[PDB]
Amino acid sequence: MTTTMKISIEFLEPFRMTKWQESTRRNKNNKEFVRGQAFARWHRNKKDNTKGRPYITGTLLRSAVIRSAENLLTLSDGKISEKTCCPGKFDTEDKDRLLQLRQRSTLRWTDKNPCPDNAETYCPFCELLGRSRFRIHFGNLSLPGKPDFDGPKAIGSQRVLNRVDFKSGKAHDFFKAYEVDHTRFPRFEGEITIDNKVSAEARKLLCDSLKFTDRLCGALCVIRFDNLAEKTAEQIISILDDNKKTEYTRLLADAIRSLRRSSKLVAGLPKDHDGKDDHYLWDIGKKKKDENSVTIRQILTTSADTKELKNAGKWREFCEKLGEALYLKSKDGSVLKETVVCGELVAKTPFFFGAIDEDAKQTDLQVLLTPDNKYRLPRSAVRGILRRDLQTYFDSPCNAELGGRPCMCKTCRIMRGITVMDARSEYNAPPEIRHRTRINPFTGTVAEGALFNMEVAPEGIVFPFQLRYRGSEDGLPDALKTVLKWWAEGQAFMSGAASTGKGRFRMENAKYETLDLSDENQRNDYLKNWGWRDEKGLEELKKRLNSGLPEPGNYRDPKWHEINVSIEMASPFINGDPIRAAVDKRGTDVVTFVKYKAEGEEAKPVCAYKAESFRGVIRSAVARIHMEDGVPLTELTHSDCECLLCQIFGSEYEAGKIRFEDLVFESDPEPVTFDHVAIDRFTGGAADKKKFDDSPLPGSPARPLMLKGSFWIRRDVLEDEEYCKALGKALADVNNGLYPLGGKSAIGYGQVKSLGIKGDDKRISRLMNPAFDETDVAVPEKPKTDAEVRIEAEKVYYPHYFVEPHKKVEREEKPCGHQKFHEGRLTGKIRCKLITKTPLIVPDTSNDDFFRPADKEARKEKDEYHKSYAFFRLHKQIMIPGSELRGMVSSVYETVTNSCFRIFDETKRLSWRMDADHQNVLQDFLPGRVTADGKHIQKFSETARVPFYDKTQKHFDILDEQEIAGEKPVRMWVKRFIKRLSLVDPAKHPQKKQDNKWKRRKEGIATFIEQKNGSYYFNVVTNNGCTSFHLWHKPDNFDQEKLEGIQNGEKLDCWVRDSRYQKAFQEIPENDPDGWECKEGYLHVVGPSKVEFSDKKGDVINNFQGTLPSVPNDWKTIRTNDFKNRKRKNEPVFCCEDDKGNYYTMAKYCETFFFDLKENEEYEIPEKARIKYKELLRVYNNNPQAVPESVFQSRVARENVEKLKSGDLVYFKHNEKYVEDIVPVRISRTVDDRMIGKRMSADLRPCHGDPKGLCPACRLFGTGSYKGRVRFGFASLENDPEWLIPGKNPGDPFHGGPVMLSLLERPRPTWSIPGSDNKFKVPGRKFYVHHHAWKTIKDGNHPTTGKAIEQSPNNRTVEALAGGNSFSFEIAFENLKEWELGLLIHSLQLEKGLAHKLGMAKSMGFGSVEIDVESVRLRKDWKQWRNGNSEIPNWLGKGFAKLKEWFRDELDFIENLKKLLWFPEGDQAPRVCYPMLRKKDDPNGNSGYEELKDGEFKKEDRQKKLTTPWTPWA
RNA sequence: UUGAUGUCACGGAACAGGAACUUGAACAACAUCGUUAC
DSSP states (O other): OEEOOEEEEEESSOOOBOOOOOTTSOSSSOTTTTTSTTSBEEEESSTTSOOEEEEEOSHHHHHHHHHHHHHHHTTTTSBSSSOBOOOOOOOOSOOSSSSSOOOSOOOOOSOOOOOOTTOSSOOHHHHHHTOOOOSEEEEEEEOSSOOOBSOTTTTOOOEEEOOOOSSSOSOOOOEEEBOOOTTTSOBOEEEEEEESSSOSSHHHHHHHHHHHOOBSSSSBEEEEEOOHHHHHHHHHHHHHHTTTOOTTSTTHHHHTGGGOSOGGGSTTOOOOSSSSSOOSSTTTTOOSSOTTOOOHHHHTTTSSSSSSSOSHHHHHHHHHHHHTHHHHTTTOOOOOEEEEEEEEEEESSOOOOBOOOSSOOTTTOOBOBOTTSOBOOOHHHHHHHHHHHHHHHSSOOOOOOSSSSOOOSSSTTTTTSEEEOOOOOSOOOOOEEOOEEEEOTTTSSEEEEEEEOOEEOOSOOEEEEEEEEEESSSSSOHHHHHHHHHHHHTOBOOSSOGGGTOOOEEEESOEEOEEEOSSSHHHHHHHHTTTTOSHHHHHHHTTSOEESOOOOSSOOOOSEEEEEEEEEOOSOBOOBOTTHHHHOSSOOSBOBOEEEEEOSSSEEEEEOBOHHHHHHHHHHHHHHHOOSSSSOTTSOOOSSSOOSHHHHTOOTTSOOSEEEOOBBOSSOOOOOOBOOOOBOSTTOSBGGGOOOOBOOBOOOSSSOOOEEEEEEEEHHHHSOSSHHHHHHHHHHHHHHTOSOSSSOGGGTOOOOOEEEEESSTTSSTTSOOOOOOOOOOOOOOOOOOOOOOOOOSSOEEOSOOOOOOOSOOOOOOOOOOSSSOOSSSEEEEEEEEEEESSOOOOBOTTOSOOSOOSSOOOOOSSOOOOOOOOBOBSSSSBEEOHHHHHHHHHHHHHHHTTOOOSSOOOOOOOOOOOOSSOTTTTTTTOOEEEOSSTTEEEEOSEEEEEEOSSSSOOOSSSSOTTTTTTSSOEEEEEEEEEEEEESOSTTSTTTSOOSSOOSSOOOOBOOOOOBOSSOEEEEEESSSSSOEEEEEEOOOTTTTTTSSSOOSSOOOBOEEEEEEEEEEESSOOSSOOOSOOOEEEOBOOOOSOOBOOBSSOOTTGGGSOSSOOOOOSSSSOOOOOEESSTTTTOSEEOEEEOSSSOEEEBOOOEEEEEEOOOOSOEEEOOSHHHHHHHHHHHHHHSOTTSOSSSSSSOHHHHTTOOSOOSSOEEOOEEETTEEEEOOSSSSOOOOOSSOGGGGSOSSSSOOOOOOOOOOHHHHSSOBTTBOOSEEOOOEEEOSOOOOSSOOSSSSOTTOOOOOOOOOOOOOOTTTTSOOOSSSOOOOOOOOOOOOOOHHHHTTTBOSSSSSBOOOOTTSOOOOOOOTTOEEEEEEEEEEEOHHHHHHHHHHHSOOTTBOOOOSSOOSSSOOOEEEEEEEEEEOOSSSOOOOOGGGHHHHHHHSTTTHHHHSSSOOTTHHHHTTTSBOOOSSOOOEEOOOOSOSTTSTTOOOOGGGTTTTTSOSSSTTTTTTSTTOOOO
16 A cells, blocks of 8 residues: 655765764754754664764655755746646644744745645645655665764764854854765665555656755755774884983974875985984984894884885875874865856965864864865865855845844845865875974074974866856856956965965866756756766766856956066075975985975976065064054064054954965076085184085076065055055065075075066055165275284294183173164175185085096095095186185184184093103002992002013913903012122222112122023022022123132122012023012003004114014014114014005013002092093094004004903002092003183183173174174175186186195194193184295195105195185175174274185185275165265274273283284295104204204293294294 | 654855074194103
């Protein structure tokens, strides 16, 4: 009696799902239950557990079909086939039921009786409505297989929705709702049961009503009927716990996260600046110990091929899930026609669609993606943007509140017939991240940890598009043909960070159509194939569409206006990006910003200049101009007031009216690399020995590096006359030269040359008119000097001459601040003109071996060679960087004003060497040994030396190898004294006995039992017959008159003397079995040390015999070859040489034997005495001057000992229960306790942060946490080069020939601080002196000797300029006080006799420049620039009346500075050169170093004969 | 896994704000080794 109907709906768009509720709050009063009534539901079996499946109710489908049929019945006047329907009844007297009512103004037709329930045949509409177990029953709809998922977060993910205001366009209350994806759950199934006694055509109405409905729950439907990442995540917490670097993790949470593009990106991580496989973050926490220590470049290479993380589908998720771990640690009518507008819209700029699901944070800003990582733009965004672009056509913001009778304004009648689809973008590449800091407007440096990220989607993504509007008006309404034309121009600002230039789509290749539904032949063809919503129907409809969008009727002037921007630079450029600096290949420290654009399926890079950076520059430029009742706009809070910044650029309570965009370079620029270094002040050399580089884009004055972009100002900001002025003013400054664009501007990066905008009918480009003063005054000349020295000939001088500072550094002024331009100070530019007078060198260290021979293979693998350089060129245009001209002027400006040492290495404690001859200090070392634990030393009593390496005895074999290392005590036979004879007491008084040594002789009986070959044996008693001995007298030419005849029993009166003799032997000497004890103690050898190797065949080696032997492979084998003193068999040697042509010599034929340990007398090793020994072992091994062999090397350097053990012997030094110094051998180097930083004063150490204050040369040039008020610039050559030595080939005067320099080895700070105790402070600042010694290098000689220099792999072959070249550069300053400008001009131009010095190899004669300050122009208001060249003689005179208030009359350091900058003017040849070591090895014979440590520069005349500048060394 | 005589949720832009900036001449001379003799 009943029939069935099996239907199934399919979705074409992600539908929406509501939340589960407890089954008592499903009432009418629950505010959240309604508002989710129209969404698909979620039913969980076993209540109190989130496990179930999604299901769609049936009453909802019923209401949708009722609405569709009610709509379809008014298109045909209320007739299905032949009979007519009744208006239907929708009344009820039970209002407490019916949880929700209808508020819709139901469509009308055929007003007549609604045929009340007292009838027996209703109108078919009342049959479908179900008026009187049911008549037509609607069954539920759920998934086909009825599966059972485990929660609402298993099928689709929740996200938040929005509701913005219109006037102040930010936002208000929000709401959230799930949304299941339609490509993983696209089908539902159910059933409708129909009685038989309903009708024969109500079924027809029902089928048509089904085919006419299209949306159920926020989607377009068509109803049809017939684990390495878990082990790695914490393994790299242990490698950070194995150190104390926890500030280096927020960046490692980001550098690895960016590897989610491809796997091959990890096989190219960078390496050290030298090239070894070491870094500062890819090799955190790895030492020599444990070679098997897995390193981060290895635990990532052991994740690239593991069969689970091979393909990118899981590789990307691997990095995403690994990076999220290292951050939680760092946290704590009957007219109706339907229009079909198809087409597509592409993205012209990177867009951003906000999607915060629940936590998702890790960046606190993410983009909206599909479940399989394709980009998508919702339909809620498109609809909310159409509403905004409609409320702008009209001038009426819709005031519809939430709830109630539907609104009826002009724009809510057009938003009631719109239907929009979604998009997928079919590109699925991962998004990139964009950092965005915030700069403190008081110090030019980033604020307190203000740094937050965001990720953006690429540009060039093609989305599909489709739209439909069905209504009464013929075709589209007037207010919708203009909006689509706005979007056709390219002004579709869809969503994202608008104020930074995000998404701007442009509708391409539009079409349209117009179907009519009020007829009866077209409508049936509309219902036949389900409109044209499906995939097949859309393609078939895509061949009936007439190209071209229609034309509007009332156009109304889009609300944004594009303004162009074009910028020319003249210098390099760099915009920082730190994370690319970590994962790159080259390994440079800081790199430039680069962005990718999606070509359509792949990504390619382009250099650019961010839009946030450009927004910030202009925003800060506008801020300093404005006064705003005294206090400027750079200190306000922007809370509830209308600023002039708070109105153009917006704030947190509204939105701005200007949208900047990225700027591109309109060429093909390629980065370069520039090395840098820090030149220490005292002992001028590379501090810390490490360099640091950066990669800018190469600008020039000939190739000016164009930039071109755009930005969009609103319409009603242009028309005003107050904001356009405030934008023209602050663009006229950006044009004049202030506000450099980019990074390291202090050394000349950025420095915009021009800026010209257009597209504003000269409404803004009206205050950018330049007007330059031209009062032509000549610059005053440099005053004549008075510092006179008296240089005579035939006397040689020295090249360093430190400058003793004063002792009062003034740090009592509060820094100014880079906010509003202060009024008492100056701001402008200086144009200089540098001219060299002695060949200059500035090397281009991009490549070595520039001076290469012809046809020679490049290199092989890893080898040393002759490094040949070239002059510094940028674009085949000889220049000089700004970092060179900054460190030259700053080091002279900070000594004129006597300020804090700006860079000075406060580490590297010093180490002198023991005094060889001095026995007063080399006596207090009391041999001992550290105890069983490394905490105490138990001394010894006395020592004696046991001979080895000789040809008398054997000790190498007959002793075992467990006691020649000093851990098994050994019995030995000592002899504290030896007994010397004499037999003629009165026959030696004149010929000897004049030396107070024969003061203990007692008696003697010349017994005799054996006569040797040349010896006379004697068994003589000493006192009375109780104590005798055996010994062998060495006869002389005064005894054979008393030993003229032997009788084997003679007796004669002789004499015995007891002499000092300290030796020890194994058992007993063969020659003398006299009184010898047998004591007990350890024994240690330090090996066969004390070698004196050379190449010149000294006196001892030339006193050999012939065929000198080779060097042995290992010791325990070395013996003695010859004697030093050959008359008496005294101190032996060992003379040998290898085949390389190198000669050795070897003393030390003995080793010391300890004995007589003393217990219950020990001392403690504190931690202070532990640093000195940890340090001393560093200096033995890393010795470039060490022996080329290793047999002759000492024990500590040979065995690479790195710390003191338990069972080892040392030579400690102590007092009162504490030890102070340890030393491995008898004579070896000491180390002071304090570091080198504590030898200066307390006010001369480098300036710290902020009280203490800031030294004066810290307030002009910057520091950390303060920005410098002076910028330099690249200097460029203007005449022709005029090389020093003619080039290899004539014709081209742009390449010079090479010259060969000398050694130039490192500077030693012990020749200046030779003492150690308390009175050896640090001298001044090491200024080199001016002279002419390059006339000798140019010929190829040596500055000290006269010999020629032969090339060796430690000297460079540079090309240099000559005397008589000119350069030009600029110096831009701001906020300088009046007197600081005086001393800066003083430090630039010196008096007429003086000269600066820059370059390389200036210890010889190389590099002498002098500067002449030309035109100086100031700046007073944004209009005029006041060429104030005629006021210098007041600044020069007011900067010298300040140096007289600080240091009243004690300016004697300035007259010592002025004697080092003195130039040898004419007919003077001051000969300066470094002394050699010995006098015997230089042909001139000028008293080398060994004769200088006694005599003139002994040890108390070195901090006095190195401070007075021009001291004649001779 | 609802209910029937009544659901404008295609009835609601996760929007608004923030300069990866500051500091640094690619430069450079005095030694290294341990004891030997009485």
